[PDB]
Paper text:
While designed to be a phospho-peptide mimetic, Polotyrin was found to occupy the Tyr pocket, with the iodophenyl moiety occupying the Tyr pocket and the thiophene ring stacking against Tyr481. The binding opens the pocket, flipping both Tyr 481 and Tyr417 out of its way, akin to what a long PBD-binding phosphopeptide would do. Given this unexpected binding mode, we confirmed the binding of Polotyrin by soaking the crystals with an analogue of the Tyr-binding iodophenyl group, 3-iodobenzyl bromide. This fragment bound in the Tyr pocket in identical pose to Polotyrin, opening the pocket by shifting the two tyrosines. The cellular phenotypes elicited by Polotyrin are consistent with our conclusion from somatic cell genetics that targeting the Tyr pocket of PLK1 causes mitotic arrest, although further optimisation will be necessary to improve Polotyrin’s cellular activity. Thus, these findings provide proof-of-principle, and a structural blueprint, for the future design of a novel class of PLK1 inhibitors that modulate substrate recognition by the PLK1 PBD by targeting the Tyr pocket.
The human polo-like kinase 1 (PLK1) is a key regulator of chromosome segregation during mitosis, through its essential biological functions in chromosome condensation, cohesin dissociation from chromosomes, mitotic entry, centrosome maturation, kinetochore function, spindle assembly, and exit from mitosis. The PBD recognizes phospho (p)Ser/Thr protein substrates for the kinase catalytic activity of PLKs12. Intriguingly, recent crystallographic studies have identified a hydrophobic pocket within the human PLK1 PBD, located adjacent to the phosphosubstrate binding groove, which may regulate substrate recognition. Seven hydrophobic amino acid residues line the pocket; whilst V415, L478, and F482 cover the bottom of the pocket, the Tyr residues Y417, Y421, Y481 and Y485, form its sides.
Numbering used by the authors: 371 to 498, 507 to 593
Write the structure that this text describes.
Amino acid sequence: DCHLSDMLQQLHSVNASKPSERGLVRQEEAEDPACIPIFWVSKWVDYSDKYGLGYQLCDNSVGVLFNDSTRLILYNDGDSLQYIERDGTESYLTVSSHPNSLMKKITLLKYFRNYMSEHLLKAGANITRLPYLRTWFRTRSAIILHLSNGSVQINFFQDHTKLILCPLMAAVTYIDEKRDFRTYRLSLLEEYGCCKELASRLRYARTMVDKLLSS
Ligand SMILES: BrCc1cccc(I)c1
């Protein structure tokens, strides 16, 4: 299930502990820099009416989830490709080899790359295996991005805040409006509690991970 069940369990636990009602809140105490995620989606472009969803990961790699549920990933070296059919079957290729099979999808991918590079701002710019985008959807309030390493990222439209959930670390990273990165250990959030806004977004995240599992 790509650790969705695990993540669901970790969020029910933090939310059940009602961490914004704790009298003596020390959210600063729940931080843990040995849980900082390796990957997250730094930019994305929804062209899903026509071709699909383009994105860039923080390592500068660029991927597309095409409508046919195939994925093409261009590594940060500008040439090496990874290709995933619906089957999940992976294969590796290079741009320079010019594979006749994927000419069209390469061109599309380069368009997405071009657009993102010139027109979009990076997420989490001022801080320091290659997964692909498994699934995604968006509500009025947010886009939800589920990576194949189990990570779930939720980007909120209103205020530009972002959640990155890592079930393997049982951790949450929170990017605020001021672009500040903070990484928390979920269990420690139950103990030290947190602010009302991190709290409501974790309630929203549990509902969103529910939604992923009903599909
Ligand atoms: Br219709 C040209 C095109 C294709 C893929 C992505 C983008 I952004 C634009």
